[PDB]
Amino acid sequence: KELNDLEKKYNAHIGVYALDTKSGKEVKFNSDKRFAYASTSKAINSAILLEQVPYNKLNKKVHINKDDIVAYSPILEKYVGKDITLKALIEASMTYSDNTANNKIIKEIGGIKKVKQRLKELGDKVTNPVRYEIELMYYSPKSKKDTSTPAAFGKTLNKLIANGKLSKENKKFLLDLMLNNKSGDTLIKDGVPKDYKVADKSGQAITYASRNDVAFVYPKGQSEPIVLVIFTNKDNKSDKPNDKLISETAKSVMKEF
């Protein structure tokens, strides 16, 4: 299609950044406008932890207590007073979008301060992590808190995971979680050809129909992925998103490759 046309059809704003890591070809559409990234950052936090903990050491346990629990933690809520491995923390965060798992992961890394320091090292001066879950979901068009642009997020995802310092084991581990989560089926996965493998992490903020999906797409025949970042939102605080918007956006963008 045409992205301008899909904005018109859905009455929404679209931010797209796609990079074929094989050729270096990019497709950009509103690639420098800020959007709340929400749960798509669970992918970033998980990758950052994996850079500092070898696969064989993922059995390390951390203690979970009452004070760690935040809203929507379908897995972690059963671990109050118990210990959980770092491996299961990552699985909870990526597969179930568990919010306590994500906050614990951020703490393991050293806090928001440390995540922000790592992004600067990667050269990402845009992604602005400020709050923990679930507060980071309170998006305001007038605040830069917990936002990034499709270009900056996409480049950070590429340098961290696609072309980064993760071991094979860890990289396969994270990518498997993304290939197998059912939460992204109505998104990028719904719009690309069946030929393609989509490893994604979706997100949704509480305000302005902020609905996102980021993924590593594997065309049939290519071993290097196409990093695809789709961020969308609407004009009213209480608007609900239509997942079809991202499905259609993904189909359209995939035509460029």
Spatial distance between the Cα atoms of 125 and 190, rounded to a whole number of angstroms: 32
Q: Is 238 a catalytic residue?
A: no
- Using only C-alpha atoms, what is the Rg of the chain? 17
Q: Is 235 exposed, middle or buried (0-12, 13-18, 19+ CB in 10 A)?
A: exposed
What residues form the annotated binding site for substrate? 201-203
Catalytic residue among 23, 31, 39, 148: 39
DSSP 8-state symbol, 71: S
For 180-236, give the DSSP string.
H-GGGTTTHHHHS-TT-EEEEEEEE-SSTT-EEEEEEEE-TT-SS-EEEEEEEE-SS
What residues form the annotated binding site? 201-203
| Contact call for residues 152 and 126 (beta carbons, < 8 A) | yes
Name residue 147's beta-bridge partners: 36
| Contact call for residues 14 and 29 (beta carbons, < 8 A) | yes
Mind telling me the catalytic residues? 39
